[PDB]
Amino acid sequence: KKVVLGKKGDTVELTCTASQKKSIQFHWKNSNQIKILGNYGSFLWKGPSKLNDRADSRRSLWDQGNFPLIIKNLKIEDSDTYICEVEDQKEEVQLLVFGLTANSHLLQGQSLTLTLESPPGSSPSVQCRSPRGKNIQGGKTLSVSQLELQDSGTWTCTVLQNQKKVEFKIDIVVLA
C-alpha cells in the first residue's frame, strides 16, 4: 500500500493508522510473517527478528490510532515489506534502504567513482551536484573523470526509486 526509502545508518518511520483514534491491538511482521513487535494491552513486546533491538514504536501516538514501527541504524538488508495488522486491516509498506560511498588519497586529476549500495529488487538511478554545481548523472555506479581542487567539498547526490527521493551528502578530499 506504500513505499518508503531509507539511508544506511539512519532511522526510518513506517506508519500504521487505525480508524478511531484509540489504542488497540496491533503488530508488525516482515514479509516472512515473523512478528517484529506489537502491544499486549499497555505492554510493548518484541519477537525473534533479524531486526534485533533496532525496532520500536512510539507510545505517545498510540492513543490517536498511530502505531508506527521505527527502525534505527538501518542496514541494507533491513529492506523488505512490512505488514502492520490493525483492526482487521493489513497496511503494507515496503522499505528500500540505500548506501552511498566513494573510492577515495584521491589526487587532483585522478578519477573518482561513487558507488550506490542497493537492496534486492531496487532499480535506482543517481544524480549528484559537485561542490561547484556540475550535475554529472549516473545510475548503479556513478563517477567523475579527472577531478580538481574545486571539486573538493560536499557533493549532493539524489537517488530516485519508485519515483521517490532520498538525499546523500558526501565530503571528498581532492588533493593536489
Partner: protein, 178 residues
C-alpha cells in the same frame, strides 16, 4: 559496561526548585529533601549500610542556581522547550481478585521537571498509601517519575492516573481496570 552510578542535580527557574540524587543502574539510591536538609534513601535498609551528609547537596544546589542564571543570560534568555510525557499504567505483579497489588504509573521522557499526577478510582482521587519518586534522570536528559497506589483488586473498580504537564493541552489520563 557493567555498572553506572550517577550523581544528578538540577535547578529550575522561575520555580526555584532544585534536586540532588544518586542513582545506580537507573534506580535511585537516595536523594536530599531540600526543605528538611535531609538524606532520603530509596529503600530504608540502604540507610543502615551507608550515609551522606545532606549539607553538601545544599551547597551544590546554591552553585547550580547561580550557574542557571549565568546560562540564562549567556543564551539570551532562551527558555526550555516543553516535551510532554509518555504515560503508562501497570501492576507491579499479576492481579488476583481480593489479593494486595500495586498500581504503577510510569511518566516518561518529559521536561521541564514539574508535573501533576493524581490517582482516580471511579472518578474520585485517592491518597491512602500512595507514594512517588523524585525526578529520575535519562540519558537524553529528559525525566522519568514513578507514582504508586497499593490496592485491592476488584472486578468493579476503574482506576486512572491523571497527568498534567506544560507540554499538554489537556489532562492526560491513563485508564486501568481488572
Amino acid at each position: 559496561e557493567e555498572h553506572v552510578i550517577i550523581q544528578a542535580e538540577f535547578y529550575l527557574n522561575p520555580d526555584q526548585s532544585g534536586e540532588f540524587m544518586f542513582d545506580f543502574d537507573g534506580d535511585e539510591i537516595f536523594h536530599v529533601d531540600m526543605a528538611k536538609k535531609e538524606t532520603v534513601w530509596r529503600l530504608e535498609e540502604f540507610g543502615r549500610f551507608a550515609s551522606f551528609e545532606a549539607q553538601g547537596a545544599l551547597a551544590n544546589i546554591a552553585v547550580d542556581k547561580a550557574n542557571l542564571e549565568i546560562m540564562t543570560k549567556r543564551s539570551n534568555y532562551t527558555p526550555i522547550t516543553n516535551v510532554p510525557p509518555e504515560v503508562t499504567v501497570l501492576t507491579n505483579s499479576p492481579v488476583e481478585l481480593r489479593e494486595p497489588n500495586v498500581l504503577i504509573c510510569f511518566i516518561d521522557k518529559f521536561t521541564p521537571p514539574v508535573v501533576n499526577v493524581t490517582w482516580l478510582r471511579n472518578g474520585k482521587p485517592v491518597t491512602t498509601g500512595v507514594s512517588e519518586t523524585v525526578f529520575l534522570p535519562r540519558e537524553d536528559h529528559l525525566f522519568r517519575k514513578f507514582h504508586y497506589l497499593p490496592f485491592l483488586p476488584s472486578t468493579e473498580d476503574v482506576y486512572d492516573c491523571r497527568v498534567e504537564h506544560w507540554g499538554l493541552d489537556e489532562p492526560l489520563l491513563k485508564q486501568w481496570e481488572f
